[PDB]
Structure formats: structure tokens, C-alpha cells
Design a protein around this ligand. Structure first.
Ligand code: HEM
Ligand code: HEM
Ligand code: HEM
Ligand code: HEM
Lengths: 146, 141, 141, 146
């Protein structure tokens, strides 16, 4: 997908303003709490019986760091996303056996967390641009399934 | 369907929302229209600019309907039978767009209410909006 | 939720189905396993060959549960609270696979019932199976 | 997607056995009756208030003929489906504005109708092969959306 120069400048500015530690942890914790069946893959991380424990789990943040790093790399390489999201796509298709709905669910949760952190600076144009970005990343990462 | 904890959380969240319902609904409509342009084909007689009087009025009507649904959370079909009939027989809208509207509403109430948008409130609002959309998308009687 | 015409059609269809429920359920399980191999990860202790005793027993159990659900069509939560708790808390199955199982069941009952598989019966069975899956996929109490 | 020689022989035999007149009409009528919101595009065809009128409408069959012809062409060209379903994909993306769920719904309805007509000859292996074929056709036809 193509983006206008103004949209590119806006998304680059906000991403530069993003704190790169707690956003991924918040996204993962909110996903696990809101959609409970997603714990079938993360049950190896320890206690997840209550949202307090889910948010306080250290492995949740330790994995959200890698998730947000992957998102940052994908955002850095927007022109070629299929080439960048190849090994991850193969891993998800082969070992994890995850249907592609969870990818868009995680993207929506990330957009919600971004809006929560940035407040009124999340204008509708920037929200649309980030929706396009997350849709592109999800489609690139889930391609072998269909 | 809904747990008492979820019902209490939804009631508290909407009570905190209060009288900003019209502006929140108008903002949700604008967000949906900008984000997804494939849902602009249901409004062919509107002027979908920024700060439109008709869009503001429709947002206020949607907000009032949502407030009534909150006030009658346990009686959704009896409260919204007319809306269900209008949305299912006349307009004939597929149930995909309700997900987009619910997500846009969630973003709108998250942006302006950072204190009350805890994970529990997030889950309660998600389930409540899903139930409202499910009730509204039906063909009965 | 369901119209009286739909309820009568579902009751007539299942009454016509009768005592072939166990074989129909076993065939539905086999069809699902062959068609979609991504749902074979929920049964790691089974021997998913053709004509398996364990698969036949599970099909019979599913058929009996469906027959009870038909006999209590207006009381799905009270009839299937235990099943809902087991499927939501212990197994933790996403609601995608229920669509595949419903479609496979529809194909199975369509293959051997050409006379009773009218469009009205098709719509009634579709809505009834969707309602059963929705009831079974929930987290309440 | 690749198919084994045995699956190819089976699908070719059954498709040779298919009646090429009423299958498309039945598929379209069943789709319209089961999912009522799909009439928003076919409301130009006349009376569709009851399933009897929906099935008796002549334009329903006249359009099901073309739908089944397109499916037959797609089945004939299995190796290259993106090249074959290009003009139709552009048309559906531009003019009709149809989300990709209806494509898989129509595929499922077609499989149900095939099972209904053929009876017990619709073995689970053939059912799986036809599911693969319809999934491939739907994915090839809906590519510009995502
Ligand atoms: C949507 C964008 C996503 C991205 C960019 C992403 C990226 C990643 C990355 C970078 C890893 C680690 C790779 C490594 O350590 O070598 C990973 C593994 C994993 N992913 Fe994803 N992922 C996404 C979505 C999801 C979703 C939605 C789920 C589940 C619902 C999921 C489940 C997992 C699991 C369980 C692991 C392995 C964790 C572990 O081994 O401890 N991923 N993914
Ligand atoms: C999700 C919750 C929704 C609620 C609570 C809701 C509520 C309402 C209400 C109260 C009206 C006013 C009816 C009247 O004044 O006669 C209305 C009309 C309408 N709704 Fe919805 N609606 C919802 C979703 C949607 C969606 C997602 C769409 C389209 C994508 C939609 C399309 C329409 C249209 C086209 C009208 C008619 C507007 C007009 O005639 O001026 N609605 N709705
Ligand atoms: C759609 C309607 C369904 C019904 C009516 C149903 C019903 C049942 C019943 C009656 C049992 C027996 C529980 C027991 O004996 O303790 C059971 C267990 C089970 N179900 Fe379901 N089920 C449905 C769908 C599914 C689906 C789609 C899956 C997986 C994709 C699934 C996975 C399981 C598993 C793994 C068990 C445990 C089997 C065992 O422990 O031997 N069910 N279900
Ligand atoms: C799934 C496989 C599908 C195939 C192979 C297919 C193929 C076709 C073909 C061959 C045409 C006519 C092109 C022409 O006349 O030049 C057409 C048009 C059309 N299609 Fe599709 N289609 C599919 C799915 C759908 C679905 C699911 C819908 C709606 C829910 C739909 C709605 C339409 C409509 C409304 C027209 C125009 C009818 C008219 O102009 O009278 N199609 N499609």
C-alpha cells in the first residue's frame, strides 16, 4: 500500500514519540485479557488467572518487547513487507498453527493502546494511516494460510 | 450473557461518560468514515464533510440510542425491536460494519477517558457492544 | 432469536433424522478431520483412522448432546451450562472451529436427506446450529 | 495449491457428471434465501419476498448460468488462477464493493448443493478436494481488497 508524504511524516513523528518499553506489554496483556482463548499458546508463561497477574507477568513484557520490535522493523520497511515477514510467517504457519484473525485482533488492540497513550493527538487521519499500516503488516505476515 | 461485574462496569463507564455522548458519537462517525471508505455508500444523501450539521445530528441520535440501550441492558430486544426491524428489513446492512463501528467507538471513548479505560472496562465495553450489535442484527417477528 | 416456523422446521428435520444420529455425528467428525487438518491438534490422544471405535463413540456423544439441545431448544443455557463451562474454561477453543463443524454437519445431513433438505430447512438448521455454537462459546458464572 | 493425480481424476469425473443448468441457479437462490442481506445487490431482479419467488425468478437462473460458467473456467485453469480472475476481481473491487466473506459463503453453498445432488458419491476425499478448489478460487478472486 502507498502512503502520502503528509501521512508518512505524521506516522514517523508519532512513532518517534512512542515509548518503546511498555506499549508492547500493554498490547499483549490487553489481548490476553480481552480474548481469553489466546492463552492456549501462552499457558507456558505461568500464572494468568486474573488481569492483575496477566499484567504483572514479566515474560509478558519480555515478549511484548520482541513483538513491538518486529512491528517497528515492519514499519521501517514499508515498501517490501512480504520479504521482511518471511521467517516469522513460516514459523507461525508451521509450529504455532494460528488462524489469521488473531493478527487483526492484535493490530486493533495496538491501535487502541496508541490512542490511549497519545490522547487527543491521535487525529482521525493518523488513525486511518495506522489502520492501513497494521492491515498491511497483518496481510503480509499471514499469506501462506490462504 | 453478561456477568454482574461486567454490567456494573458498563454502567459506571457510561455514567462517567455522561453528557458528552453527542460529541462522542459524532467523532465516532467521522472516524469510521475516514478510516473505512467502503461504508460511505449507505449515506448517499449526506454531506460528509468535517463539522457537518447532519453528521452531528446523526451522532447525537446514535448516542441517545446507545444511552437507552445502557439504561435497558437486560431488555435489549424489547428496547430495540423497532431499530432491529428498520436495520434488517429496510436498510439490509451486513453485520460486518457493526464491528467497525464498535471499534471506532472504543477508540473514541479511549482517547478522551484515559482514567476509566482499564482492562476490565475495555473487556466489559467490548462484550456489551458485541451484544448490542448482535441484538440489532436479527430477523424476528 | 428463533421464529416459530424455524423451530417447527428444526423439530421436523431432527424427527426425520431419528436414530441415525450416531452415524451422522461420526461421519461429520471424519469429514471435518479430512477437510481441515488444523483442527486435529485438539485430539492428541486419539487414533484418527477410518472406522475408529473412539471416533465412533465421540460422534455418538456429540449426536446425543445435539438431540438434547433440540429437545430443549428454548432452554439452551440451562441445558448446556456444563458443556459451556468445559469448552470455555478447560479446553479454551476459539469460536472458529464451531463454524467448520456446523458446515460439516450440514453437508452430512444434506447428503443422506435429499427430500427434507429444502431451502427453508436449510435456513432453519443454519440458524439453529449458529445459536447452539453461540451458546456453547461463552464465559458466564 | 497443488492436487494429487487421484484427486484431480475424481474432481474431473464428478464435474463431468455435473448438470450445467440448475446447479448455479440453486446456488444463487440458496445464497439469497439463507443470507438475506445479499439482496442489496440483486434487488434489481424483481420480486424476492419469498423463497418460492426467489427460486422461480428467471433472472436468478440466467445469472447462475454465468456464475457456474466462471467457476468452470476457473476449475479448468487451476495452475494460474490470478491471471484468469483479473477482470472479475477488478469489477468486484471497483463497482460492486463486496467484502470477501460472501465469496466463501457462495463456495460453501455450492459445495452443499453438489453434495445434495450427488448423494453418497460425495466421499470425504472429494469433499476435501472441492473445498480446496473453492478456497483457491475465492482467494484468487478477492485479492485487491487486502
Ligand atoms: C500481529 C503481528 C505479530 C507479530 C509482528 C509477531 C511477531 C513475533 C515474533 C518477533 C516472535 C518471536 C520470534 C523469535 O523469537 O524468533 C513471535 C513468536 C510468537 N508469536 Fe507472534 N507475532 C504477531 C502475532 C501473533 C499473535 C496474534 C499470536 C497469538 C494469538 C502470536 C503468537 C506467538 C507465539 C506464542 C510466539 C512464541 C512465543 C514463545 O516462543 O515464547 N503472534 N511472534
Ligand atoms: C452499532 C450501533 C448502531 C446503532 C445504536 C444505530 C442506531 C440508529 C438510529 C437511532 C437511527 C435513527 C433511525 C431514525 O431516526 O429513523 C439509525 C439509522 C440509520 N442507521 Fe444505524 N445504528 C447503528 C449502526 C449502524 C451502522 C454500522 C450503519 C451503517 C454502516 C448504520 C446505518 C444507518 C442508516 C443509513 C440509518 C438511516 C439514516 C437516515 O435515514 O438519515 N447504522 N441508526
Ligand atoms: C459444535 C457443537 C459441539 C457439541 C454439541 C459438542 C459436544 C461435546 C460433548 C457432549 C463432549 C463430551 C464431554 C465429556 O464426555 O466429558 C465434548 C467434548 C469435547 N469436545 Fe465438543 N462439541 C462441539 C464442538 C466441538 C468442537 C468444534 C471441538 C474442537 C474443534 C470440540 C472439542 C472437544 C474435545 C477435545 C472434547 C473432549 C474429548 C475427550 O475428552 O475425549 N468440540 N464435546
Ligand atoms: C464466488 C465466486 C464468484 C464468481 C466466480 C463470480 C463471477 C461473476 C461473473 C461471471 C459475473 C458477470 C460478469 C459479466 O457479466 O461480465 C459477476 C457479476 C456479479 N457478481 Fe459475482 N461472482 C462471484 C461471487 C459473487 C458474490 C458472492 C456476490 C454477492 C454477494 C456477487 C455479486 C455479483 C453481482 C451483483 C454481479 C452483477 C450482476 C448483474 O450485473 O446483473 N458475485 N460475477
Amino acid at each position: 500500500v502507498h502512503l502520502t508524504p503528509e501521512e508518512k511524516s505524521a506516522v514517523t513523528a508519532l512513532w518517534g514519540k512512542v515509548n518503546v518499553d511498555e506499549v508492547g506489554g500493554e498490547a499483549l496483556g490487553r489481548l490476553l485479557v480481552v480474548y481469553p482463548w489466546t492463552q492456549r499458546f501462552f499457558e507456558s508463561f505461568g500464572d494468568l488467572s486474573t488481569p492483575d497477574a496477566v499484567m504483572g507477568n514479566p515474560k509478558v513484557k519480555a515478549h511484548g518487547k520482541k513483538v513491538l520490535g518486529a512491528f517497528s522493523d515492519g514499519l521501517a520497511h514499508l515498501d517490501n513487507l512480504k520479504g521482511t515477514f518471511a521467517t516469522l510467517s513460516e514459523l507461525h504457519c508451521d509450529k504455532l498453527h494460528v488462524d489469521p484473525e488473531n493478527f487483526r485482533l492484535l493490530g486493533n488492540v495496538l491501535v487502541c493502546v496508541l490512542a490511549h497513550h497519545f490522547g487527543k493527538e491521535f487525529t482521525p487521519p493518523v488513525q486511518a494511516a495506522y489502520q492501513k499500516v497494521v492491515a498491511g503488516v497483518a496481510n503480509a505476515l499471514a499469506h501462506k494460510y490462504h | 450473557v453478561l456477568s454482574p461485574a461486567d454490567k456494573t462496569n458498563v454502567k459506571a463507564a457510561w455514567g462517567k461518560v455522561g453528557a458528552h455522548a453527542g460529541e462522542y458519537g459524532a467523532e465516532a462517525l467521522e472516524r469510521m468514515f475516514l478510516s473505512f471508505p467502503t461504508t460511505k455508500t449507505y449515506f448517499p444523501h449526506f454531506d460528509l464533510s468535517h463539522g457537518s450539521a447532519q453528521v452531528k445530528g446523526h451522532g447525537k441520535k446514535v448516542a441517545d440510542a446507545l444511552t437507552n440501550a445502557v439504561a435497558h441492558v437486560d431488555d435489549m430486544p424489547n428496547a430495540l425491536s423497532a431499530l432491529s426491524d428498520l436495520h434488517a428489513h429496510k436498510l439490509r446492512v451486513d453485520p460486518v460494519n457493526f464491528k467497525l463501528l464498535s471499534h471506532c467507538l472504543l477508540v473514541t471513548l479511549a482517547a478522551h477517558l484515559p482514567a476509566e479505560f482499564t482492562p476490565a472496562v475495555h473487556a466489559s465495553l467490548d462484550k456489551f457492544l458485541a451484544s448490542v450489535s448482535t441484538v440489532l442484527t436479527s430477523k424476528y417477528r
